[PDB]
Amino acid sequence: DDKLHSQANLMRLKSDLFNRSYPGPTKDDPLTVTLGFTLQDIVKADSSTNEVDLVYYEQQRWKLNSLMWDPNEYGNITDFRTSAADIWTPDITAYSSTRPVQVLSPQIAVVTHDGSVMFIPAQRLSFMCDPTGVDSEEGATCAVKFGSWVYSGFEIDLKTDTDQVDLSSYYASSKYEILSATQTRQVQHYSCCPEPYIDVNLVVKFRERR
Amino acid sequence: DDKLHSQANLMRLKSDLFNRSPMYPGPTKDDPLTVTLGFTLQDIVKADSSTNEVDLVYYEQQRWKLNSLMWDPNEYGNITDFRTSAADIWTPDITAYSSTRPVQVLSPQIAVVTHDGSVMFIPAQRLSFMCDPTGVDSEEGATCAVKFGSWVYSGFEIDLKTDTDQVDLSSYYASSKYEILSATQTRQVQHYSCCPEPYIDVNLVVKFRERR
Amino acid sequence: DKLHSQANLMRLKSDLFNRSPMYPGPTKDDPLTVTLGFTLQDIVKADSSTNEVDLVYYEQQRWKLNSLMWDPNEYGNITDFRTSAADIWTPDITAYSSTRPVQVLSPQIAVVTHDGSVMFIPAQRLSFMCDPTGVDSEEGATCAVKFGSWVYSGFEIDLKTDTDQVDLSSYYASSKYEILSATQTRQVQHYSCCPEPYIDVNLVVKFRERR
Amino acid sequence: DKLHSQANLMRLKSDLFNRSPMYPGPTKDDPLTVTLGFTLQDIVKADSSTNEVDLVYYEQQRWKLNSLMWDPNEYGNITDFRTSAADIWTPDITAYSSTRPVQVLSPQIAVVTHDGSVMFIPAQRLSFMCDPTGVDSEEGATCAVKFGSWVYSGFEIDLKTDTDQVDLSSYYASSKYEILSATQTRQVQHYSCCPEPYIDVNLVVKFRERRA
Amino acid sequence: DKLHSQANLMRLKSDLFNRSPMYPGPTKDDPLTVTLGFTLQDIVKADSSTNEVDLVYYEQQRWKLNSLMWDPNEYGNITDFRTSAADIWTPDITAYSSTRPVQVLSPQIAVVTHDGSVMFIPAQRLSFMCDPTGVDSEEGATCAVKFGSWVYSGFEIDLKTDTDQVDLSSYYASSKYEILSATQTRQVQHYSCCPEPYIDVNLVVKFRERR
Numbered sequence A: 001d002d003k004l005h006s007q008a009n010l011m012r013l014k015s016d017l018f019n020r021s022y023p024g025p026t027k028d029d030p031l032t033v034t035l036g037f038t039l040q041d042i043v044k045a046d047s048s049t050n051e052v053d054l055v056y057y058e059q060q061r062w063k064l065n066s067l068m069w070d071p072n073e074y075g076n077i078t079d080f081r082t083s084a085a086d087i088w089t090p091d092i093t094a095y096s097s098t099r100p101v102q103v104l105s106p107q108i109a110v111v112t113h114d115g116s117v118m119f120i121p122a123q124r125l126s127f128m129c130d131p132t133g134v135d136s137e138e139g140a141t142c143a144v145k146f147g148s149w150v151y152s153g154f155e156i157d158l159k160t161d162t163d164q165v166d167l168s169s170y171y172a173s174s175k176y177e178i179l180s181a182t183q184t185r186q187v188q189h190y191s192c193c194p195e196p197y198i199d200v201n202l203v204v205k206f207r208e209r210r
Numbered sequence B: 001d002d003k004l005h006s007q008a009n010l011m012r013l014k015s016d017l018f019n020r021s022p023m024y025p026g027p028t029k030d031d032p033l034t035v036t037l038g039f040t041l042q043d044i045v046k047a048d049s050s051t052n053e054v055d056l057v058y059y060e061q062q063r064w065k066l067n068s069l070m071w072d073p074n075e076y077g078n079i080t081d082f083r084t085s086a087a088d089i090w091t092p093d094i095t096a097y098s099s100t101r102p103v104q105v106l107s108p109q110i111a112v113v114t115h116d117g118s119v120m121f122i123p124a125q126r127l128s129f130m131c132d133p134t135g136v137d138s139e140e141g142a143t144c145a146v147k148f149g150s151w152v153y154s155g156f157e158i159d160l161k162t163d164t165d166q167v168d169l170s171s172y173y174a175s176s177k178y179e180i181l182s183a184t185q186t187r188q189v190q191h192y193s194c195c196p197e198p199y200i201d202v203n204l205v206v207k208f209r210e211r212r
Numbered sequence C, E: 001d002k003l004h005s006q007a008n009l010m011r012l013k014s015d016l017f018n019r020s021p022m023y024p025g026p027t028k029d030d031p032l033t034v035t036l037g038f039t040l041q042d043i044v045k046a047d048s049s050t051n052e053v054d055l056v057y058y059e060q061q062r063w064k065l066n067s068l069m070w071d072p073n074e075y076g077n078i079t080d081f082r083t084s085a086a087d088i089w090t091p092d093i094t095a096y097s098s099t100r101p102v103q104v105l106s107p108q109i110a111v112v113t114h115d116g117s118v119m120f121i122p123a124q125r126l127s128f129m130c131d132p133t134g135v136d137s138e139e140g141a142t143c144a145v146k147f148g149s150w151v152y153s154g155f156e157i158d159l160k161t162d163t164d165q166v167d168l169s170s171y172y173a174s175s176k177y178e179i180l181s182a183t184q185t186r187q188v189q190h191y192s193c194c195p196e197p198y199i200d201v202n203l204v205v206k207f208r209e210r211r
Numbered sequence D: 001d002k003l004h005s006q007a008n009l010m011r012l013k014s015d016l017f018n019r020s021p022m023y024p025g026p027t028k029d030d031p032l033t034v035t036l037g038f039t040l041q042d043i044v045k046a047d048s049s050t051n052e053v054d055l056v057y058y059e060q061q062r063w064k065l066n067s068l069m070w071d072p073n074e075y076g077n078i079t080d081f082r083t084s085a086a087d088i089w090t091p092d093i094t095a096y097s098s099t100r101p102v103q104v105l106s107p108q109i110a111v112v113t114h115d116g117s118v119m120f121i122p123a124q125r126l127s128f129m130c131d132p133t134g135v136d137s138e139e140g141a142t143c144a145v146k147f148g149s150w151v152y153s154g155f156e157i158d159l160k161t162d163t164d165q166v167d168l169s170s171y172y173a174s175s176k177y178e179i180l181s182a183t184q185t186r187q188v189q190h191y192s193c194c195p196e197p198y199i200d201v202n203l204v205v206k207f208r209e210r211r212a
């Protein structure tokens, strides 16, 4: 009865936000995405092509007024899960991938009654890295920047919560140990366009384990 | 003729369950769900010590139960269950937590739904995950482990469960390159710094060595 | 004229799928016989570092639904047609010991005849569990893989073979591996847990390095 | 003027697709002639450990349907148009001895002309069964692969070649293998599957390693 | 206010996509000019065993349609919008000597501007026919690959470059190969068979092993 209600309520909530009622951010309605990285593994550094492969996940966070509901209208539901395909999601792309990104996790996001969204895709990424000096104590340094591919800083702004990449889940028996890992926001201009584009540069210092 | 009668019943039941109500939204804290997991290990195919990746083929038995999938067989010609495509129904988002490649489905994706509302789903899969196979060529063998759990639901929404903690090795390829010394599956609760909700996984530990 | 036969087809095809209720698959009450047969074209690869062997073959499948029947006279003497394999029901026949997902090498089109039978012959490359030790000896290597329904018992889908000899008439003459024998044997088994028989077809292949 | 030329095409295409019975394919009552021709671009790779060879080539397919005829005058003198291959019926021409799925290198777009003829030219990378022995000799290696309909017999699809010579006028001049000769020839054949004969176009390629 | 912009952009796309039948593509009578430009990011791999070289670049494509024009005054001063590439017409620009299907590295969203212009910048990994002989010398290797429409001629689609100098400003400083020169050149092709011309852009890159 009451469970059939919660189920009934939640079914209703979704139907109101999705099926009854977002073309993306505009310059009069810009959006801020908070990015954060949890590096899990450096699986492979290839010195013959200069490609390194990382497994990691990407915390993405944003807020949309058109996803706001009063819990009192809906049996006091505070949040729900939904297929990422049921909502709009940012096009956060790596700028120096050498291969299509591979998805290791379900495409499900959590929507909270204030309109805030959290999406945490796990992925394997091949990207441009010269791993020379990885077999030394100084290690090798590599970098890759992530941003929206089609939206300028007038439509999508990026930010971090910490400038420190989360290394708490890093694979303890990886071939590569992590010396340091930062995530830093940047504003850049490219020659196609007059407008700034925003990225978050992920810099990693790593070396062989011993 | 009587056969055409029983198809009618099954058709009628499947259209009643699937086309009648807005489909199940997934579990909530008000309406939690217990999912039982079990692993049957077929083969360790590859152990790469240059990247520290290992590849498993296995069956992942998932069963759970919904009150929206219940029916009285007295109203549907004594039908007690049916096979259906896994895309027709809600399924749990049980994910490996330390995979390195996308998981490859080796089998059809067909569930069995029973009149009490229980669903059983057993996909066969190839998984690559993080495994330092150091010790595999020794007699004491190598030991790797991988956790499985919901990717987006906490312990307040999805509770995991096992029926046993012993992993089924009765179908393990007899001529695998690796023999299995032991395989276990064990439920675990952990809290995380970000969040006061508890979180639940089934850690799958495997010891193996080069078969010789 | 030829335009009418064109039109009876999209009627016949409308009558069968769109208009009627969907086939829910076989039941214990309405079992289905599926006839299975393999044409082996090539053993492409045998990897003794992972114990995986790669085969390329065609798999002939045949079954019959009363729900796919029509009177030719009622549709302009159309006795059969072609249709996309996804527009109809197909049996969930699977290799039980593959290591990679099957790769389809042929179009997914079946032929449906007026008596209600279906023929469907996908070409595939399969990687399955096989120790090739002895493949470089005169006596060779032996590998075996079973096929059968993943979720249907013998009381719902009855597997069958026309013959227990695999067709080697299209086997690649200049392959790396020479075929000594290739059988496809039907097996029926019972399990203490369960009241129904479980059927599968065991593809057993004896082969060696050619020369 | 541009809106005008645009309106005629949108109208021409709409009459053909949206307002008409789709063509289901050839019958014995209404057989179809598909014509094939190959343009070999490259032999990328020859693997003598598996006996697989990799080719890059585009395959010219043409056929004619009354279903697709139109008077150019009723349509602003439009004599042809380009359209997505999914909007129309295409033949199921298949390599008979591929060892991998075919990889498509070009847009899936065909050209339709007012007499109803259709020209579809897909570029492909094919892996197929080929023993490259003798490729390091002056006489070279020889391989062969048949292309034909997978589900239609020689009474439903009649396969032809405008010519027996494969077009080698775009063959990569700095390829690892030079072509000694390449033919495309219609054969008729039987299969145990089915009572009726099937038609294919056999592509026999003769090639060796390039040396200066 | 922000709800208005959302609504304004929605009505715009509604009026642009639904009032009229999508652009059916260019014709002899309504030809389109497409501008191309390459930003070469990295030569990742030069295989001398297969003579294939792998590039990663992004390819700027630009065109203008009268049917994508609007007055920003009528639409909340929206000067441009982002939209999925499946919602509009895009050109079939293909690499003519690819050995592998192109791998897409960027989202497939275009930017439509109020004057009717479209900018679409797909980032790709391309494998193509190239003899890397000389890459370990001082003179280096040279490779070439043409880009153009697969199905249109110069009568329907014309190509253009803004410059003939490939943008090397995002080239990977620690790549295995250093770029000696990179050009992008519009070319016209005349064939005995055919009155229509054919336009391509010819990407020529000179490079060598980095020291």
Ligand SMILES: *[C@@H]1O[C@H](CO)[C@@H](O)[C@H](O)[C@H]1NC(C)=O
Pocket: B073, B074, B075, B076, B077, B078
């Ligand atoms: C179920 O089977 C029992 C025993 O054969 C029979 O009496 C009963 O009528 C059946 N009920 C239905 C609804 O078919």
Ligand SMILES: *[C@@H]1O[C@H](CO)[C@@H](O)[C@H](O)[C@H]1NC(C)=O
Pocket: A027, E077, E079
């Ligand atoms: C409209 O938006 C454009 C684009 O940024 C801006 O430059 C211009 O000033 C705006 N016009 C008005 C009247 O605000």
Ligand SMILES: NCCCCC(=O)c1cccnc1
Pocket: B059, B112, B122, C096, C149, C150, C151, C152
């Ligand atoms: N009964 C539904 C799933 C069964 C899947 C399975 O483990 C299996 C394995 C081997 C043969 N048949 C079935």
Ligand SMILES: NCCCCC(=O)c1cccnc1
Pocket: D058, D121, D170, E096, E097, E146, E150, E151
């Ligand atoms: N209809 C297909 C034309 C494309 C073939 C082509 O232009 C070509 C020819 C030679 C080298 N590179 C490309």
Ligand SMILES: c1cncc(C2=NCCCC2)c1
Pocket: A148, A149, A150, A151, A190, A192, A193, A197, E109, E110, E111, E119, E120, E121, E122
């Ligand atoms: C518009 C359309 N597609 C890509 C971009 C760009 N985005 C990222 C790099 C700068 C150029 C802009």
Ligand SMILES: c1cncc(C2=NCCCC2)c1
Pocket: C109, C110, C111, C119, C120, C121, C122, D149, D150, D151, D152, D191, D193, D194, D198
């Ligand atoms: C019917 C269905 N599927 C494939 C075929 C055949 N076509 C190719 C090989 C010969 C038989 C017939």
